[PDB]
């Protein structure tokens, strides 16, 4: 209907709870493996944030896998930073991690993050 | 870290995608039964929005069930309105549904919705 009212903080409060479930390992259904570092997560959150995971988990065969191995060139710290961003909206971008974060966001197909990384790099040149 | 940047629209864009997955029946893992009306959903979203579902899906036995039957006194339309609110932040509150929505939100333990229903009722008295 066109007559709905909207609760402003609802989406952020939902994301905060999904991150609390992740921290407590509640209903996590996939392990992402990045160069032997393992990260537990919810498939739905990964699909909701990344073009790569959206493609993987809508595939008839890959949707059922409980372990996904990323390309060996992917940096585990860059992945960890992006996984935290998916569950919090906050991106820990620093001079010492920006190149790894941008390369990881390109691989993961997270366009807004890639944009932002490009702008921070361009400002330093 | 204390040096994070924040993407304002991220949480709302995540919720929009979780609702698109629900509409396409992608990775839904539970059916909620309300007086023979069935609603498919994601356990994590229900837990993130409702005190009742948070209690149900953190129980060692109930966490594994694929079907949950609600109390027969619960109105299916009231439940449908609240399930839409969980996935969109928008509540379709109308004179003809407010009593059923408030009773359902009380049962589901959604305090902000109950508050709001009380204020709209009080204004009409």
């Amino acid at each position: 209907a066109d007559s709905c009212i909207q609760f402003t903080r609802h989406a952020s409060d939902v994301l905060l709870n999904l991150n609390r479930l992740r921290s407590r390992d509640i209903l996590t259904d996939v392990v992402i493996v990045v160069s032997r570092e393992q990260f537990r997560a919810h498939k739905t959150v990964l699909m909701a944030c990344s073009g790569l995971f959206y493609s993987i988990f809508t595939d008839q065969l890959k949707c059922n896998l409980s372990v996904i191995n990323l390309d060996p060139e992917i940096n585990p710290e860059g992945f960890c930073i992006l996984l935290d961003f998916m569950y919090t909206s906050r991106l820990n971008l620093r001079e010492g991690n920006i190149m790894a974060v941008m390369a990881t966001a390109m691989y993961l197909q997270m366009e807004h993050v890639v944009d932002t990384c490009r702008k921070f790099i361009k400002a330093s040149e | 870290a204390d040096s994070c940047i924040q993407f304002t629209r991220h949480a709302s864009d995540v919720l929009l995608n979780l609702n698109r997955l629900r509409s396409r029946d992608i990775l839904t893992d539970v059916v909620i039964v309300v007086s023979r009306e069935q609603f498919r959903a994601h356990k994590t979203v229900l837990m993130a929005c409702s005190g009742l579902f948070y209690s149900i899906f953190t129980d060692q036995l109930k966490c594994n069930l694929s079907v949950i039957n609600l109390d027969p006194e619960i109105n299916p339309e009231g439940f449908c309105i609240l399930l839409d609110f969980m996935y969109t932040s928008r509540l379709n509150l109308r004179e003809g549904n407010i009593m059923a929505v408030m009773a359902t939100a009380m049962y589901l333990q959604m305090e902000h919705v109950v508050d709001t229903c009380r204020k709209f009722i009080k204004a009409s008295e």
Partner: peptide, 5 residues
């Protein structure tokens, strides 16, 4: 909170 969207 609540607003008219």
């Amino acid at each position: 909170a609540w607003v008219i969207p």
